[PDB]
Symmetry: C3
Subunit: 341 residues, 3 copies
């Protein structure tokens, strides 16, 4: 064993939640140990019950958020159980060399592999499967993508010498899906990913998704699964898109501090309405809630948001601030003496 550092095992949690971590740390570098198990399975992706043949890390779309600190080593055990049908691997955009690790991690069903990469670059980054050739886009748009956050050891800052600390963190993975339709326009079902491939590839080629979803399905983060917050809390929202651009917006809020390219060596932008996640990247926004109520978090192509699945909700508890906004007069009949031309 050449590398003589303490080891720490991390238990991942399903998105949009994030495993326990420290923001700032005075611990030295560690070997941070993670396990990812590939799971191919049929999943429900919309509110009408449409299914499709997904491929996942750890059973979720997105794959879980991994969080480490600058200078840590990340030792990932990737497992491809023999119930799976395809080979898989992993490419970390946070890592240096061998196609992000993909060239060192190709495993057949029944195999596992252990990759270590040094976390030399701060930010949020995509990770994704990339077996080779046309299998690269297919595995990614089938769900095989997640993100990793590499925090500075002193935690986040505003790029102007002031520390920033979040009260809460959520990870929003956005997924573009390409579900085949029959001649009548109904979504087609298949018994395996391999059977779905040819028809799926034809949809992929036209670069227009059938669905754009957060946390793996339309409505996943609405209703009973809305994201909780409180007035006053500084919330970090990490957003990834491994294949296609997105334009996040918090309806009724702002991005107080936004790293749209997602890299903490760059000062954030302030007071954004809408930001831009380039396909193949993660970004992050901090917002301090000022008002209670429901907020919609969307990609601000509103067709994608409302009609293809890409809306989440926050439910924020606290007291309303009438100075920031008030209904001066409730809806009422237009006065008879009005002229409205």
């Amino acid at each position: 064993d050449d590398l003589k550092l303490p080891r720490q095992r991390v238990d991942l949690v399903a998105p949009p939640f994030v495993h326990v971590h420290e923001q700032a740390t005075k611990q030295g570098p560690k070997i941070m140990e993670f396990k990812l198990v590939v799971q191919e399975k049929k999943m429900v992706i919309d509110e009408k019950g449409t299914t499709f043949q997904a491929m996942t890390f750890n059973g979720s779309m997105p794959g879980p958020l991994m969080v480490v600190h600058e200078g840590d080593y990340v030792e990932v055990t990737l497992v491809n159980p023999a119930t799976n049908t395809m080979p898989h691997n992993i490419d970390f955009h946070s890592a240096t060399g061998a196609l992000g690790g993909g060239a060192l991690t190709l495993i057949n069903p029944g195999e596992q592999v252990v990759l270590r990469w040094k976390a030399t670059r701060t930010g949020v980054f995509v990770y994704h499967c990339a077996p080779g050739g046309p299998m690269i886009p297919w595995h990614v748009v089938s769900g095989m993508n997640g993100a990793v956050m590499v925090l500075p050891r002193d935690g986040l800052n505003d790029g102007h010498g002031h520390s920033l600390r979040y009260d809460r963190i959520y990870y929003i993975g956005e997924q573009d899906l390409y579900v085949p339709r029959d001649e009548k326009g109904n979504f087609k079902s298949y018994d395996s990913p391999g059977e779905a491939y040819s028809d799926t590839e034809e949809v992929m080629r036209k670069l227009t998704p059938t669905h754009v979803v957060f946390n793996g399905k339309a409505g996943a983060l609405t209703g009973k699964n809305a994201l909780n917050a409180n007035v006053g809390e500084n919330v970090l929202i990490v957003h990834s898109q491994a294949n296609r651009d997105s334009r996040p917006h918090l309806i009724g809020g702002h991005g107080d501090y936004v790293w749209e390219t997602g890299k903490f060596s760059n000062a954030p932008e302030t007071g954004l309405e809408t930001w831009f996640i380039r396909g193949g990247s993660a970004g992050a926004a901090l917002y301090k809630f000022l008002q209670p109520g429901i907020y919609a978090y969307v990609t601000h192509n509103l067709i994608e948001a409302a009609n293809l699945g890409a809306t989440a909700h926050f439910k924020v508890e606290g007291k309303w601030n009438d100075d920031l906004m008030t209904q001066v007069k409730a809806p009422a009949d237009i006065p008879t003496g009005s002229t409205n031309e």
Copy 2:
């Protein structure tokens, strides 16, 4: 009346022009009073006379630019005359709470509502209708979107302690439209927005506009309606797109100072060729004209610019500067002694 500030009524003007305002001000905060009247009407959107069932604020696409200063309060009377067929509301991306105001402003035909929001965030911002669900994209891509500018009280600056002042301002609202076609490819006409909806939604779902226009129609800002300027003038060009990305470019010019994310707390970028307006945002560019003549202002997807409607012109008066550019030799026959392989 809890809020004891002076009130000022603003008369809006149709785009691309902007109502009278001060850049820098020493007045304290005011309650700035605006009126927006929803108008559903058939409108001509291209040079072949194609019509479509539009929905507007104040009869225009885009809706008018509102201009206030940081710390002002904005009291908006939204009116939905009883000649309209649908409910409408308004979401200000500049505002904090209640989905930007949409949750406090839903009005049926025959009603009006009064919303007040504090202008706490500087920049240019979209405002748009957002009734709920699939009606959100439909009302926005039918034309119900505009912008508001919240200036710093000291006016604009270059992010490096130098004041910037514009001689002229224009507001370019870009609109993506989704007009149904019949089996022969001809655009379909309808008698009401409700009748157009189902067919329109089908076009919307494929995320490919039929038209991309400035100021509501192909050719709106060309010919006799070209934008005027003079050599030496510093012109602010505000650009909004409430649903879809755009990439503005001034052909023959530059962006001297560009806030592509549109927020004045961030230093502008300098000397851009082309900039990027993320769907769901406004941005702004300053340019000091150096040469007279015709300039085309486009989105630099040139197919959209030339073939789907997204070109404006500036006509700039003044004297040509042969140091910056000259025709050394006019077109002439290729010399006989030339080799051109």
Copy 3:
């Protein structure tokens, strides 16, 4: 002759290579003389041998990279040989006035023209043909676009007072193509550009390319034409896209310093995973290679990368650094005592 500066003739080279130049210079301003010869010709654009009716500067897609310094004058002789069928011109996004030069450079087959523009703006910039109207997008998506780099006279810097110097430079021109298909889905062939136009325009209108290629064809920069580098070298990668957005990513690497909007008066961003070239612009990234092996350089819409042609390779010589990344355990059977749920 009013302009009394030394003249220097530059011999252009085919992309992805770049003509000999100095980074930093103490020479004063010069008149830098370039020749571009339009060539319309059928070209092979994919690995199955698909052809299409291309239009080029100097016989290549992209056109060659021109490199000058701030304050130089650029005197371009544009030649349209009489074997061509169409008029052509040139618009420099680096230039000020007359639609970038397009309004001074329209030439019929059999003619040439000489344009001079002052290089007042630093950065990488697109140049492209723009005859007028619908011919603008058609000539650009037929291949008539390249880039020019205007270096500061002191060479590049990190925006924080430190000089940056590249060991190598490559120019990656990305081209979106719109090749017609017949009723069976096979790509159609034509005998001239004029014959291809009507069918091509119909594909263009739907804003979905059939191919997205680097250096004019799928596979152009893979295999024997991979880009060479060595561990330790700082490589500048200039990327242009004259019509459509792109999201470059170096698989297994990063962008150490990235000017995504492409203009050297703005500090670069650091440590990017993926960056964004807005359609109608050039950008640039510096990366110091740290690991040997194969790197893929893609647009990170992976469908475009793997299935529509947009992948290049770097082959990097040197010694592997096991500290940055190592395969701890090669692929092996999942242990019997494992639980992987």
